[PDB]
Design a protein around this ligand. Sequence first.
Ligand SMILES: O=C(c1ccc(Oc2nccnc2N2CCOCC2)cc1)c1nc2ccccc2[nH]1
Ligand SMILES: O=C(c1ccc(Oc2nccnc2N2CCOCC2)cc1)c1nc2ccccc2[nH]1
Ligand SMILES: [Zn+2]
Ligand SMILES: [Zn+2]
Ligand SMILES: [Zn+2]
Ligand SMILES: [Zn+2]
Lengths: 308, 307
Amino acid sequence: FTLPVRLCKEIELFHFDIGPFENMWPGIFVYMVHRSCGTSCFELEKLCRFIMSVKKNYRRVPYHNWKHAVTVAHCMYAILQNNHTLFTDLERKGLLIACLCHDLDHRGFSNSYLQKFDHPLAALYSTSTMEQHHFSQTVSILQLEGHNIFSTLSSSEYEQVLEIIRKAIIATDLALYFGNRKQLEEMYQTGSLNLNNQSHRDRVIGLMMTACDLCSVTKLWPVTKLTANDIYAEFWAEGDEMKKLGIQPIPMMDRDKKDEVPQGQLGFYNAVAIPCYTTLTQILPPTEPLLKACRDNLSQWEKVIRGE
Amino acid sequence: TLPVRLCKEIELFHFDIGPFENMWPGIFVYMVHRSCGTSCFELEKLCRFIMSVKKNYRRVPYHNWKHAVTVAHCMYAILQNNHTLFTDLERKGLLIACLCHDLDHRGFSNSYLQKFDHPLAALYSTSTMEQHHFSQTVSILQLEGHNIFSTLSSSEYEQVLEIIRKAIIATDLALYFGNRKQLEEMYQTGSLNLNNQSHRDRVIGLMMTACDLCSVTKLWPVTKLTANDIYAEFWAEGDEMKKLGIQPIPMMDRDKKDEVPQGQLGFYNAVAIPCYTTLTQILPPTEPLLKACRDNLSQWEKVIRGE
Ligand SMILES: O=C(c1ccc(Oc2nccnc2N2CCOCC2)cc1)c1nc2ccccc2[nH]1
Ligand SMILES: O=C(c1ccc(Oc2nccnc2N2CCOCC2)cc1)c1nc2ccccc2[nH]1
Ligand SMILES: [Zn+2]
Ligand SMILES: [Zn+2]
Ligand SMILES: [Zn+2]
Ligand SMILES: [Zn+2]
């Protein structure tokens, strides 16, 4: 498993696409962990066994699948490589893993639908339902024989990296991003923001997770547009299921409103995506290429609205 | 509050603090209050400290009170554009360190002192003047009503005094070469880590070098005029070498003043550009220091040709 010449070069770029060849993705992840963390961070036999078991617990859904897991992990890699001196030894181990596992066992449905349907996970986890489950799955996979990639850490170190991972996976709940960014934006403008404060640090990691999870909007236009087809294929399926409960779904998830997709994306870029990468770039300036691509894609969506 | 123009231009890296000596203390207080906050030091006590520091700098061409306040401003600019990295203690201590870092400088290098057989060279065998600078800082803090860190706990007071000590010692330019080479390797391999204390000390050591040489990052007129003051000290030291029967290096020899352009060219190539290059790699927001340094190198090339 040696990475080809075009891949070694272009994996350093934020807008890299991991390609259609599924069996190279495990190798691509190991390359990223070895460059970001080091070759002696993990026992290689355990890591691959952990990687393949994680792959097995992702589902064949249009968007929230194995490819998305690795794509999110890669965005994080690109953030780590360009802000590398900021992160602790534990963060260098736990963040890439958190990103790989952050949508483990996704059904293809929102937290909202799980509540409406009354799914068992909704009763077990009231807030951030899928996210608490994703972490639960991550812990459950670590406890399989030979899957403890953190076995050489002390007890203290093990509990700390699992907390990092937990908070990071929970932060991928988009309902928490709005409040979190507001705080960060306020902390940055008043100059109170400080990475040596653990709570402030958690918030910045939480924003990084959001930025990685939304990174499809920071790719080149063709990747962004084609990835959009997979996102809506899931939402339209959820809206179909909402109608089967006798509930009118929001326009976002109604396939009968395909025509309004460009306007819906433009609304999302202005209200969510642009603010996320704007604030991230203020806190971490080397992440600007993400913001730059998001603005280029914003311009393309309004180019589609005008009909050109 | 400062006048409107200073408020705006003090945030710029290439800011010059001006000829008005009695505005410099107020410039420093302003910088301290924006980096750290308005409730870090007791103002009356801080002003008393500053004027005692002022009184213990000497009337020499370059290593004077103006140098001290100018170095502190570069550190202020660095801290303001990398505000999230450093703690409250580190911001407090680094500005103060910068202000105190050349305390009681005579206008002579360590090598002259050890070759003259000066008492300080017997006391401090390595980084002679630098160990003296810190020693002077401690003496000023020990005076009645001068301990600006009196609100701190003992634990915190010791931490900031170590920050100040290490930072001042790093301004020994003989330590810079080793420090930069180590940071370059750690940056390339990816092992560089600011949460590692020893690594963090080195980055601060490089920041101190960068602030200390910041005359090369100003606009050309400032950079060129400041060079007259630097060479005035060096030539005076070169005269003292000749007094001892020792032929000084061309750097300190006033007979070879027409080689200055080439001497400066070689300094930028070998010390200054590599310093700010490495600093920009580790802290990208300090990039304007590099650009400006590159621009002044162009000017020195332009002087050598005659253009
Ligand atoms: O805001 C919309 C919206 C917001 C976010 C969406 O998901 C994502 N889009 C781009 C990138 N990433 C997205 N997510 C990925 C999966 O997790 C949630 C965010 C889709 C539509 C939206 N509103 C609409 C109204 C009518 C028709 C279509 C509409 N679309
Ligand atoms: O390299 C020189 C050199 C290097 C550094 C110098 O001092 C500084 N110049 C610019 C900015 N900062 C300087 N220092 C400030 C004080 O501490 C030492 C560095 C001067 C000449 C140098 N070599 C020369 C040979 C002949 C004639 C003149 C020569 N000059
Ligand atoms: Zn998710
Ligand atoms: Zn996700
Ligand atoms: Zn000095
Ligand atoms: Zn100095």
